[PDB]
Design a protein around this ligand. Structure first.
Ligand SMILES: Nc1ncnc2c1ncn2[C@@H]1O[C@H](COS(=O)(=O)NC(=O)[C@@H](N)CO)[C@@H](O)[C@H]1O
Ligand SMILES: Nc1ncnc2c1ncn2[C@@H]1O[C@H](COS(=O)(=O)NC(=O)[C@@H](N)CO)[C@@H](O)[C@H]1O
Lengths: 428, 427
């Protein structure tokens, strides 16, 4: 959610910034509801003052031995008028909240204006894509050769967009997640967390999956013994449970930043992807990801974005994987982001770079939904939140398999993963 | 599923064995359906002979120049009767299979007869429970002290019977999983697998979760774009996807045994657990577990059960955790097992042992459902086995409580220190 004061005091300036994202805010519809809400708030306050005064008059008339029936009739009338005005105000506030919950975040001023991915801007590059002296194989072919990636088995067990990994390739996928968690928790200052992989509706509203993106998730049916409290969804990223750990809290500013990481499976319906990324591990219903989340004071979020993006870049550099860093344009950003960097890793068989991390500054947008606040050394204000992949493990495995392949199909194990793979030098 | 030959031709002998595990086979109902099936099979044969004979008569009457119209109508009526016979036979065969899928496995002869968990038999015990010179703290209190187990945060994110682990305790939980996978893959001969955590209905029938235990699982709603193919359930154990990897296969016996391991989250509704293990990590909707699965030739499954149970015992021994090995009696075994060992670990704050692994020989029960066979020639069903090596959450409970110090710090078990960047103590 955006600051309601920006929506009430600068609705036209807010609408203009939102148009850059391709979002059309109906200023006049919201303004008419806000005007009706102000009228109803004044009415409820007037009715409450009038009812309270008439109640004091009853006490006095009763003590004076006067007839209290005319006053009792008035107090009853006023109580019902107050109940009607409160019901109308609650319905109006709900209508306003429903609109407010559909609005994407305001982009930061330095975000370039653009309509889609072609308008994103490269800000830096690292490393040189390997020049091969043989015909490269993609990760699916490499995984078949080593009996390490089995998509057919996953279709039998479950369905499309799942995988079964086996043996040395499964060990390498595990080693990547362990190297990532260790780097972030031993060198980058994040605290490790084990989280639920199912979450409730309050959590989904907190991070912005709800109300607009229910279709992007897998939902579980309620349990018979928890009939009214188990409408859950599988997490699409650890950003959702981690960010919500501060929901409803007031944190002392001196206890910020809070830096968290977790390795979890991530579940996505991938709706709207018919025929998109049908090869291999690129777009799965289930993928592992090592996530970074930061909860910071509002003054420090742009600085924290650079730090967190650097933490993701360090994973790629230590793995020897060439990449490019892109700033997303206004039209290509996620709902809650105000500024995002994507890291795109070189994928030899595709002869292009593919997204391996998104790092975003969410400003106070999720903090507002979650009422996550901070207190200065005594008035409170919303914190800022940030999230970033460090990294998507499946896509990192694709990049390692393809960039480290040898002419005979073996895959050299990157130096940093060897201590996690019992010293193994090559797959195959 | 049981061998259909045994159910059809020695139902009372099968009933005698099933009654020892507390299951009453309805021999009368099954026998009545089987007789209707055999009668319909004969009726179909009578009808087909009549249809072929009347069709042969048409050809003769056509060559002679006689009126073939009455014989043509007779052939059509016989075709309709054959159609009805076949539909009734298919419906009956489905009804018989539906019943067959509700029957538990036959217990092995050496399984002690008993009614419930009080009739289980202790086989062996290892180690000696620690004697404490201070008041024992439970894992929940220890987890609060170190800001490492946060159940209230999990209620806020999700609901009851979930947890959020943080910091050193979360790292210890991870180290346990890594130590277990490395032991099984590097010393015990298991192949590591990454598996789906959602599975389809065929997979659930393959391992026995369906038809009877749908209420034990979390089910996902179908996806709008996979409307007829995405009725999935979250896995309750990696046994489900791993064992189904051999579904529909004919394996050369020289390629057996197949030994697989995986580390996965496990999801369970825990229906019927009102007020049982309300506090802590012992009974959760989500828990991690390092699973072992073996696919073996039928002659080797009892030896494989001893080997696999020993693999799970080695995790406890290496972690210095006292335990007991129990053989479950007939009345306390799970649906698909023919023989199960319960490894139970010492839990200081509860002053008792709690199950940390179940190791089972499933005989040919899942192999039959999955049509997983092997060739030595003729084919036969493989045997399947599964065993926890171990449930990670309960192992964490056991490590936290058994290694606690007077001041609330927790000594890190020696074997986990290389997986915890050399950390000696939690705190
Ligand atoms: N369906 C998918 N299959 C495989 N990898 C995926 C899939 N969807 C996303 N990813 C990977 O996960 C990364 C992060 O996903 S994201 O949606 O862009 N961003 C987030 O989820 C944020 N919480 C930051 O991690 C992507 O950059 C991509 O590498
Ligand atoms: N809800 C739960 N929460 C935590 N741990 C559990 C839960 N249910 C079972 N476990 C643990 O998981 C172990 C194995 O579970 S089991 O159902 O007994 N058996 C299996 O699942 C078999 N596939 C062997 O692993 C149990 O011994 C127990 O230690």
């Amino acid at each position: 959610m955006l600051d309601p004061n920006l929506l009430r005091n600068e609705p036209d300036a807010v609408a203009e910034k939102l148009a850059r994202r391709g979002f059309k805010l109906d200023v006049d519809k919201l303004g008419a509801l806000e005007e009706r809400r102000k009228v109803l708030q004044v009415k409820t306050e007037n009715l409450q003052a009038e009812r309270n005064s008439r109640s004091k008059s009853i006490g006095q008339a009763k003590a004076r031995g006067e007839d209290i029936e005319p006053l009792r009739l008035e107090v009853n009338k006023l109580g019902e008028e107050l109940d009607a005005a409160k019901a109308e105000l609650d319905a109006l506030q709900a209508e306003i909240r429903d609109i407010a919950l559909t609005i994407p975040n305001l982009p930061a001023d330095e975000v370039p204006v653009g309509k889609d991915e072609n308008d994103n801007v490269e800000v830096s590059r690292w490393g040189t894509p390997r020049e091969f002296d043989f015909e490269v194989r993609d990760h699916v072919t490499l995984g078949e050769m080593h009996s390490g990636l089995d998509f057919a088995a996953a279709v039998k067990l479950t369905g499309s967009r799942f995988v079964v990994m086996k043996g040395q390739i499964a060990r390498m996928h595990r080693a990547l997640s362990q190297f990532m968690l260790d780097l972030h928790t031993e060198q980058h200052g994040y605290s490790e967390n084990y989280v639920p992989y199912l979450v409730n509706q309050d959590t989904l509203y907190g991070t912005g999956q709800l109300p607009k993106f229910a279709g992007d998730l897998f939902h579980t049916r309620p349990l018979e013994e928890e009939a009214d409290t188990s409408n859950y969804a599988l997490i699409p990223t650890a950003e959702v449970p981690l960010t919500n750990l501060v929901r409803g809290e007031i944190i002392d500013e001196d206890d910020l930043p809070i830096k968290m990481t977790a390795h979890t499976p991530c579940f996505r319906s991938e709706a709207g992807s018919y025929g998109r990324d049908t090869r291999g591990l690129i777009r799965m219903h289930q993928f592992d990801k090592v996530e970074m989340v930061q909860i910071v004071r509002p003054e420090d979020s742009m600085a924290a974005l650079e730090e967190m993006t650097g933490h993701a870049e360090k994973v790629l550099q230590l793995l020897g994987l060439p990449y490019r860093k892109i700033i997303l344009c206004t039209g290509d950003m996620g709902f809650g982001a105000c500024k995002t960097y994507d890291l795109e890793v070189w994928i030899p068989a595709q002869n292009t770079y593919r997204e391996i991390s998104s790092c975003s500054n969410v400003w106070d947008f999720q903090a507002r939904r979650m009422q996550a606040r901070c207190r200065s050394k005594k008035k409170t204000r919303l914190v800022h939140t940030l999230n970033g992949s460090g990294l998507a493990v499946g896509r990192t495995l694709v990049a390692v398999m393809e960039n480290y392949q040898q002419a005979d199909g073996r895959i050299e194990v990157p130096e940093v993963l060897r201590p996690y793979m019992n010293g193994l030098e090559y797959i195959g």
